[PDB]
Design a protein around this ligand. Structure first.
Ligand SMILES: [Zn+2]
Ligand SMILES: [Zn+2]
Ligand SMILES: [Zn+2]
Ligand SMILES: [Zn+2]
Ligand SMILES: [Zn+2]
Length: 161
């Protein structure tokens, strides 16, 4: 397919200890205040975090106060127009809201998804969501966890943004 939509979903964050990537408690309370930014990387999906485009340019997808393990259920959508792509990386940064610039992040996650022919449905109604997939973290792997899933489907060229 040369014109298709990639839909990814940040399903949830699970941080039962209430800790940052350096292993210390959020705000030294363990009462984390997650701010989730994200970017769907089609140009450098196999490169080190953060890929093609710096996290400073990412849009905010979700905020909560005093939620260690929030349900998120928010989508990050990009179109591939005029040709093929074989993978895409949903890059996610989670900070605590407090001392944004200074406190270590909660996490740096890479949700790498394949886009083989079988992964791109002929249309949105026949698209199947892939399974809930644990994103790869720079630190605290299996202690601070992010879950995402993707679907993809052909769209008319005139709707390909
Ligand atoms: Zn072609
Ligand atoms: Zn949990
Ligand atoms: Zn969902
Ligand atoms: Zn905080
Ligand atoms: Zn760090």
């Amino acid at each position: 397919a040369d014109f298709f939509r990639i839909e990814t979903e940040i399903q949830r964050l699970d941080n039962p200890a209430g800790i940052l990537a350096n292993g210390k408690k959020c705000d030294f309370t363990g009462a984390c205040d997650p701010v989730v930014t994200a970017f769907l990387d089609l140009e450098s999906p196999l490169s080190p975090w953060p890929g093609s485009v710096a996290a400073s340019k990412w849009k905010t997808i979700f905020e909560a106060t005093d939620q260690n393990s929030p349900t998120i259920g928010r989508s990050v959508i990009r179109d591939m127009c005029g040709g093929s792509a074989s993978n895409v990386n949903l890059r996610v940064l989670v900070n605590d809201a407090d001392s944004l610039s200074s406190q270590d992040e909660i996490g740096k996650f890479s949700c790498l998804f394949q886009l083989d022919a079988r992964d791109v449905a002929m249309d949105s109604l026949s698209a199947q969501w892939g399974p809930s997939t644990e994103c790869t973290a720079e630190a605290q792997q299996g202690k601070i966890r992010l879950f995402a899933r993707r679907r993809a489907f052909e769209i008319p060229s005139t709707s390909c943004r």
